[PDB]
């Protein structure tokens, strides 16, 4: 018995009459390139992607961010080609490339990258970390306003916050220095949330910091809707995510409902959900910038729990599932003598009635 | 499942085969998988120190 294929079978379009005249791969790399392309295409048979691939929703992710900037491609391309001609014309450039002594300036590369491809790379990385999935229930935005968060450590050093770089709770004891590029007369809202910190509820977050109606980029002059709380990742609970979300306010907004008492040391009051907060303020507010870091427990967290939060410190432990053994049988034929140990509760000699 | 089969570059016999294939032709082979049922573990509150 046979069943006809449910679709086009692999290696069907190949003409087998002219096999000798057909071009061959001849290289492993050319086959691999084609093989990788074939693996990514949708198929009507069972595939590994079907069972292991993350089940993305068919509808595209709603964009909730700022409009893309308008650029003149013709003028941009003309200027770019002119620059390469000038660089290539220099004889010293050619010799350095030929002798493999040339190098690129990393500082300049990052500055240009931040202006151009930075936002899309930050969006890609934010998606990988799950920020969009958790903060906005899958809605994504392009962080078109670069946000520079740095924790002052000591008097001469800074700890920059990028996009998942690790910052310890000790370094984040005090509020960070936040600087972004903003025009005059604009308004902004900056918040800090711990996606993974919440102890009682899995889906909830902790609002560590909230600044509202910030005039321009003068963060110090914004209203302290919620005071700053240093991160308190619990011992043994893993690595948490803390995200800075900058928002561009179309108009002045009232955050009386979101106002938290100063100081706020009640975890119930700190409980916060970004989706709910943004949804009510969506009409007058748009996500602009994004930063985040990764924080694990350190000894300073004990200070937060005992003193600031006036609670006992919760310790957690990663517990693995118990080992599986088949049902014990009265006669374990051909099994070693250690079979009996597998089903023994205690290791100390028992004497029964005696 | 049925998956695209790419041999190891060190496998002389299989590598010879694919380089002689006509361009656009991809080999396929049957693979057997195990979809993990349980997670590696769970964090559990052990103390309140």
């Amino acid at each position: 018995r046979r069943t006809p294929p449910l679709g086009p079978m692999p290696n069907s379009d190949i003409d087998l009459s002219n096999l000798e005249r057909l071009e061959k791969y001849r290289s492993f790399d050319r086959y691999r390139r084609r093989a990788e392309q074939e693996a990514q295409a949708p198929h009507w048979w069972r595939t590994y992607r079907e069972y292991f691939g993350e089940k993305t929703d068919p509808k595209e992710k709603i964009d909730i961010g700022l409009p893309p900037p308008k650029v003149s491609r013709t003028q941009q391309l003309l200027e770019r080609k002119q620059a390469i001609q000038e660089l290539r014309a220099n004889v010293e450039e050619e010799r350095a490339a030929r002798l493999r002594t040339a190098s690129v300036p990393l500082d300049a590369v990052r500055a240009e990258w931040e202006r151009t491809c930075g936002p899309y790379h930050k969006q890609r990385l934010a998606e990988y970390y799950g920020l969009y999935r958790d903060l906005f229930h899958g809605a994504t935005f392009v962080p078109r306003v670069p946000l520079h968060v740095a924790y002052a450590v000591g008097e001469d050093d800074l700890m920059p916050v990028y996009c998942g770089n690790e910052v310890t709770p000790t370094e984040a004891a005090q509020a960070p220095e936040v600087t972004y590029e903003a025009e005059e007369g604009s308004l902004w809202t900056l918040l800090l949330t711990s996606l993974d910190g919440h102890l009682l509820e899995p889906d909830a977050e902790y609002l560590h910091w909230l600044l509202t109606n910030i005039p321009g980029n003068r963060v110090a002059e914004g209203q302290v809707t919620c005071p700053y709380l240093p991160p308190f990742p619990a011992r043994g609970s893993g690595i948490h995510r803390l995200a800075f979300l900058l928002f561009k306010q179309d108009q002045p907004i009232d955050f009386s409902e979101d106002a938290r008492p100063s100081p706020c040391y009640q975890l119930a009051q700190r409980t916060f959900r970004t989706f709910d907060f943004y949804k009510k303020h969506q009409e007058t507010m748009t996500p602009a910038g994004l930063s985040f870091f990764q924080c694990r427990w350190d000894d300073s967290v004990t200070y937060i729990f005992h003193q600031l939060l006036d609670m006992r410190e919760p310790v957690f432990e990663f517990v693995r599932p118990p080992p599986y053994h088949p049902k014990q049988k009265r006669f374990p034929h051909r099994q070693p003598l250690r079979y009996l140990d597998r089903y023994r509760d205690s290791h100390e000699p028992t004497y029964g009635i005696y | 499942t049925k998956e695209v089969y790419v041999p190891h570059p060190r496998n002389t016999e299989a590598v010879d085969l694919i380089t002689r294939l006509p361009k656009g032709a991809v080999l396929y082979k049957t693979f057997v998988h195990v979809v993990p049922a349980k997670p590696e573990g769970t964090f559990k509150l052990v103390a309140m120190l």
Binding site: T3, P10, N11, L19, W45 | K2, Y5, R20
Partner: peptide
């Protein structure tokens, strides 16, 4: 498997010229 529509998805010797010593 023979009965299944994916029968023969792994066929590859028809794509290579036969080798004769």
């Amino acid at each position: 498997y023979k009965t299944k529509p994916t029968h023969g998805i792994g066929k590859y010797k028809h794509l290579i010229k036969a080798e004769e010593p």
